[PDB]
Design a binder for this molecule. Structure first.
Ligand SMILES: Cn1cnc(Cn2c(=O)nc(Nc3cc4cn(C)nc4cc3Cl)n(Cc3cc(F)c(F)cc3F)c2=O)n1
Ligand SMILES: Cn1cnc(Cn2c(=O)nc(Nc3cc4cn(C)nc4cc3Cl)n(Cc3cc(F)c(F)cc3F)c2=O)n1
Ligand code: NA
Ligand code: NA
Lengths: 301, 301
């Protein structure tokens, strides 16, 4: 028992991280087979970090302006191309440590692990959720550009996020095909994140985790319906709950014998009265960064 | 002069459309070089159209269960793989009519042309916008699955949409890497589109088009600020306006000498009093499916 913010083991990703330098700009890249993926922003200098024309900038470059360091080993760039907001550097050596992988785009509410990197060197691992407003509340310093987010399914690494920038305390990036999450662009303009909301299905999954771990004080005998719940949820800036959400919680309802709409009634009460100085799984706030599948993986293993 | 819902010429796409059959399921595919892209749903029959396990279904198939017709010419499938929600069919002949192309993911508010197809045969072309809730208000009958949406930049076709399903009168699909727009899944569940909103920057671009074409009756001498405008816009279910939006409208402000915040004042009045039986560019509603770039392309050519 117990319940922690648990990340995936990062070994399979650590062996793919490399350093990329173009001029005085250095950042991280992801080396899979004979391609290095990195943010296209690496081809800017201070002169063009506010309104770059990346097609122009990339024309003016040759393969030898790109320095790719895999630890000490230098890799030879033999070709480059741009795909949306990433750069693909073709190199002469296929990474022998290339895991089985795929490139997937995640939806808001889903979670993944982040391997934060500096100078191509892995520094730490953490778990976070894609927020409804398409940012993540990460932890990143200067030099972290190109760090990646991933899940593991079986033996397969699904890459889903590449870090590009920080915007007013939160973080924005792309999928691995170079398409931004959210309405952001890889330049400096007046861009801010939109209003965020609480991920309801995740809050419910976490209340189930609490019950499994013996925290029962918030339960009550009442029930409710989706409509009455969503009416209250909207008032508190909670995502509305659908029938698919109810179905996804199935296995946790089953394991604890508490019906979803039963648990919604408890949630409704928590939202209206607060917790009043009690805690749930060691928190005094309703936590929304654990998916139904995270709970299952951690509570039934 | 004049102003119409104008689509891109579709010749370059028409030569890529093919028919794909697997069993009794037929639909459209997109043939570029030696790969056919189509919705993975084509590997279902009625038995598994409600909760399919696509990895299982695809295991049980061989290359010869796939019938690909390019008009009359039959193409030989020599390999298949799944990428997210599309199928990639490797075939023995590269399409000689393959234009220069790329795969891009568009953002809400952006527009594109749709080439509606049945049995691999192009049937019509129309222009539409990706809505803020990630659906499109298209026009599609049964058999249109696999139809694609695209823009043309110079000589390059940017594919951005592949049609998968209709959900309560509106349409949902993926980008060409197989990732859904919006929170939808390619099965039958209880999924509905979220609340839609009006795309404000597009409404403003269209008011500029009206001025260029001589409709001036809604203008007035007042100005306003972003904050007061967005306060009114929110009440009417209009996307908030940012400083980047203001900058994108630059060229149209320039050409007409009406400042953005000046035009916002007119918009504020239209929202509060209505149009009162007058029309703008032949419409009695505020139109939001024309981007600043659509207006420029059509009004300055
Ligand atoms: C505080 N923080 C949290 N996350 C981030 C991510 N991030 C970053 O690591 N670096 C950035 N700009 C660079 C400056 C450089 C100076 N040198 C010598 N080399 C540099 C390389 C980079 Cl990438 N930025 C800013 C940034 C990066 C982009 F990719 C982009 F499109 C716009 C941006 F404003 C940054 O956010 N910093
Ligand atoms: C009215 N309308 C508007 N757009 C659409 C798109 N669309 C479609 O064309 N076909 C679908 N299902 C199929 C039935 C078939 C019967 N035969 C013999 N062959 C068939 C092939 C198809 Cl693809 N659907 C439904 C649908 C398609 C999906 F890709 C999906 F993931 C879920 C779905 F419910 C459909 O929406 N119809
Ligand atoms: Na209850
Ligand atoms: Na005015």
């Amino acid at each position: 028992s117990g319940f922690r913010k648990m990340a995936f083991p990062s070994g399979k990703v650590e062996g793919c991280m490399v350093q990329v330098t173009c001029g005085t700009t250095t950042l991280n890249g992801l080396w899979l087979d004979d391609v290095v993926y990195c943010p296209r922003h690496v081809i800017c200098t201070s002169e063009y970090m506010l309104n770059p024309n990346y097609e122009d900038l990339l024309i003016r470059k040759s393969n030898h302006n790109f320095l790719v360091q895999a630890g000490n080993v230098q890799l030879r760039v033999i070709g480059h191309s741009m795909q949306n907001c990433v750069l693909k550097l073709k190199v002469d050596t296929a990474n022998p440590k290339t895991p089985k992988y795929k490139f997937v785009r995640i939806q808001p509410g889903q979670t993944f692990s982040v391997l934060a990197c500096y100078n191509g060197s892995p520094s730490g691992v953490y778990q976070c959720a894609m927020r409804p407003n398409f940012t993540i509340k990460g932890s990143f310093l200067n030099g972290s550009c190109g760090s990646v987010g991933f899940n593991i399914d079986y033996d397969c690494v699904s890459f889903c996020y590449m870090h590009h920038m920080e915007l007013t305390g939160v973080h924005a990036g792309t999928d691995l095909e170079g398409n931004f999450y959210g309405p952001f662009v890889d330049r400096q303009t007046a861009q801010a994140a939109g209003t965020d909301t609480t991920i309801t299905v995740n809050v419910l999954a976490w209340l189930y985790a609490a019950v499994i771990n013996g925290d029962r004080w918030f339960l009550n005998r009442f029930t409710t319906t989706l409509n009455d719940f969503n009416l209250v949820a909207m008032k508190y800036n909670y995502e509305p709950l659908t029938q698919d959400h109810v179905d996804i919680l199935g296995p946790l309802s089953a394991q604890t014998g508490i019906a979803v709409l039963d648990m919604c009634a408890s949630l409704k009460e928590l939202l209206q009265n607060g917790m009043n100085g009690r805690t749930i799984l060691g928190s005094a706030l309703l936590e929304d960064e654990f998916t139904p599948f995270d709970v299952v993986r951690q509570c039934s293993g």
